[PDB]
Ligand binder design. Structure first.
Ligand SMILES: Cc1c(Nc2ncc(Cl)c(-c3cnc4ccccn34)n2)cnn1C1CCNCC1
Length: 302
């Protein structure tokens, strides 16, 4: 008469001794609990000590802490320079900890927003070169995911993060969705402004629609994270986009970058470039070391 439905967490080789962990600065607050910065011993090869991000959950329910552990654990499948790494778990005792790679400059949306001139002398908007470097890291990260049979479905600037050295990576899954909440629309909460026409039509997502979204992220970069289709309602976006409407070339946006956007925003998904193809087109523009750290240039990219 039935199959039993009891969710559980299973300690594995990602388990890390609590005593090896310390927490300092508060980074913010996630859905299950507060997240801190801190320091973890013995979690990176040949690194006695590593600065990390610690996502925590004693007042929470066991159902919740279980849900949090399993979800967070999704990130375990990934080992790529351009994807935020999970370094450990402390499931034993409380509070529950998940130890992540620290991205000191936060999420890309926030970072981009911080580049906006205050209302003093200011840094000029990011160069073509800088923007392109970002585009390529993001694309490398997505290529990796695709190679790993994954479809992201929520690729946006908010869902990328930024390291100390300014490297952009595919962010820890699901961290800005409730923060940048107006970037979503319950029509399931969907990132309508980032979505392909086909996805707006039948609610299916592919790698090809991830590419669409990639285009939108580039647009974000070039606008310092304006709201796409800023003048339009959520409902009006559905129609515009489904009807072949496109985002405008941002002021001062270098031609080349807008061209990139354009390849991504082709109506027919089958005509969009792949992430690999995207990287191939700009690889010469990439910082030297890309060849050493990228999925693209690795033996895994076969
Ligand atoms: C340092 C930092 C991260 N770095 C980071 N690195 C790894 C992870 Cl895994 C996380 C993370 C995951 N979930 C949350 C929820 C809130 C804040 C940070 N995180 N954050 C994210 N935001 N920030 C700050 C940016 C300046 N404004 C205050 C926050």
């Amino acid at each position: 008469s039935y199959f039993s439905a009891a969710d559980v967490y299973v300690p594995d080789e990602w388990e890390v001794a609590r005593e090896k962990i310390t927490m300092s600065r508060e980074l913010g607050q996630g859905s299950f609990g507060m997240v801190y910065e801190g320091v973890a011993k013995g979690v990176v090869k040949d690194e006695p000590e590593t600065r990390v991000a610690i996502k925590t959950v004693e007042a929470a329910s066991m159902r919740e802490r279980i849900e949090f552990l399993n979800e967070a654990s999704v990130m375990k499948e990934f080992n790529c320079h351009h994807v935020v790494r999970l370094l450990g778990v402390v499931s034993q005792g409380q509070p529950t900890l998940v130890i992540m790679e620290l991205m000191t400059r936060g999420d890309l949306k926030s970072y981009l927003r911080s580049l906006r001139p205050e209302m003093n002398p200011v840094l000029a908007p990011p160069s073509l070169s800088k923007m392109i470097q970002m585009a390529g890291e993001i694309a490398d990260g997505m290529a990796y995911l695709n190679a790993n049979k994954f479809v992201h479905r929520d690729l946006a600037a908010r869902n990328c993060m930024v390291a100390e050295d300014f490297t952009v990576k595919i962010g820890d899954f699901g961290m800005t969705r409730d923060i940048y909440e107006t970037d979503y629309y319950r029509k399931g909460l969907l990132p309508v402004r980032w979505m392909s026409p086909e996805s707006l039509k039948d609610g299916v997502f592919t790698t090809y629609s991830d590419v669409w979204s990639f285009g939108v992220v580039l647009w974000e970069i070039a606008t310092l994270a304006e709201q796409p289709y800023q003048g339009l309602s959520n409902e009006q976006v559905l129609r515009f986009v489904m009807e072949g409407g496109l985002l405008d070339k941002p002021d001062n946006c270098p031609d080349m970058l807008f061209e990139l956007m354009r390849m991504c925003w082709q109506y027919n998904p089958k005509m969009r470039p792949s992430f690999l193809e995207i990287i191939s087109s700009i690889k010469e523009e990439m910082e030297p070391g890309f060849r050493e750290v990228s999925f693209y240039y690795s033996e895994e990219n076969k």
